[PDB]
């Protein structure tokens, strides 16, 4: 297919986010590359407005599931690549248990040969010294399953999953995710059978970087369908 063939090699990625969480405004720019053949993402993000007013881990899911590895036998279930190059809208509500919520709107599409994720994020209802605004989350990231279902009336998909953020006291901050994606263009897109994406992510720092930043290495494989 046209969209799947755009991902057989390494593809440059740009991420641009503007956010407002409880009136804290901020922006993030990211750069890196994806290799969907291996489900692989490598990026570096920089807060361009100074200090990031929320913990970096809370933004990982917001910061390109077209780079997930779909096994060959699951090609007919890969909505994300099928929407390319014209792209898709991705919307979420992220509910931090017993704290505030993010609502995100993003568009993911090619600009030339570069895959771009442009995001607007709005956060409300956060506790001033909760785990988010109080920066109580560990700088690490767990492994999840992202459950995908077709959303036929939208010519798209939905996803529902549970992100676990470790808290510095050893506890866990749940972030419930609900997601809907809608294609932008007029080519045919794939409406999948139920399946999920198996994720893992590693967060690190660049030792030469004194801006507030995050280095991310992530691997994602589609699963849950056998034939």
Find, among 98, 126, 156, the residue nearest to 19 by Cα.
126
Region of residue 162 (left: phi > 0; alpha: psi -120 to 50; beta: else): beta
Please report, for the domain that includes residue 48, its CATH number: 2.40.155.10
| Rounded Cα gap, residues 167 and 77, in angstroms | 35
Rg (CA), the chain: 17
Distances (CA, A) of 91 to 38, 118, 202: 26, 12, 24
Phi, psi values for residue 171, rounded to 5°: -80, -170
> Domain range holding 148?
2-223
N-terminal to C-terminal alpha carbon distance within the chain: 19
Taking alpha carbons only, the member of 148, 150, 137, 138 closest to residue 198 is 148
Closest to 158 in 3D by CA, of 148, 170, 166, 167: 148
Residue 106: alpha-carbon gap to chain centroid:
10
Cβ–Cβ < 8 Å for 11, 28: no
Domain count, the chain: 1
Nearest CA-CA partner of 199 in 169, 219, 173, 224: 219
With helix as H, strand as E and coil as C, how does the chain read? CHHHHCCCCCEEEEEEEEEEECCEEEEEEEEEEEEHHHCEEEEEEEECCCCCCCCHHHHCCCCCHHHCECCHHHHHHCHHHHCCCCCEEEEEEEEECCCCEEEEEEEEEEECCEEEEEEEEEEECCCCCCCCCCCCECCCCCCCEEEEEEEHHHCEEEEEEEEEEEECCCCEEEEEEEEEEEECCCCCCCCCCCEEEEEEEEEECCCCCCCCEEEEEEEEEEECCCC
Alpha-carbon distance of 66 to 69, in angstroms, equals 8
CA distance 30 to 17: 9
In this structure, how many other beta carbons lie within 10 angstroms of the beta carbon of residue 157? 26
| Expt. technique | X-ray
**What was the resolution (in A) of this experimentally determined structure?**
0.9
33 touches 11 (CB < 8 A): yes
| Listed residue (202, 216, 207) closest to 64, CA to CA | 216
User: Does residue 126 contact residue 21 with C-beta atoms inside 8 Å?
Assistant: yes
Could you identify the residue written with the tokens 């014209």?
86
Asked if 182 contacts 88 with a C-beta cutoff of 8 angstroms, the reply is yes
């Amino acid at each position: 297919s046209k969209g799947e063939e755009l991902f057989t090699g390494v593809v440059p990625i740009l991420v641009e986010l503007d956010g407002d969480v409880n009136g804290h405004k901020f922006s993030v720019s990211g750069e890196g590359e994806g290799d969907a053949t291996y489900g692989k993402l490598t990026l570096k993000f920089i807060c361009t407005t100074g200090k990031l007013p929320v913990p970096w881990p809370t933004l990982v899911t917001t910061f390109v599931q077209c780079f997930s590895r779909y096994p060959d036998h699951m090609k007919r279930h890969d909505f994300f690549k099928s929407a390319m190059p014209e792209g898709y809208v991705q919307e979420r509500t992220i509910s931090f248990k017993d704290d505030g919520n993010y609502k995100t709107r993003a568009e993911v599409k090619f600009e030339g040969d570069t895959l771009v994720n442009r995001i607007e994020l709005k956060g409300i209802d956060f506790k001033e010294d909760g785990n988010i605004l109080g920066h109580k989350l560990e700088y690490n990231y767990n492994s999840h399953n992202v459950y995908i279902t077709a959303d036929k009336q939208k010519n798209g998909i939905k996803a529902n999953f549970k992100i676990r953020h470790n808290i510095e006291d050893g506890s866990v901050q749940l972030a419930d995710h609900y997601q809907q994606n809608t294609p932008i263009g007029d080519g045919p897109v794939l409406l999948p059978d139920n399946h999920y994406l198996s994720t893992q992510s590693a967060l690190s720092k660049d030792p030469n970087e004194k801006r507030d930043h995050m280095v991310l290495l992530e691997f994602v494989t589609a699963a849950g369908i056998t034939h």
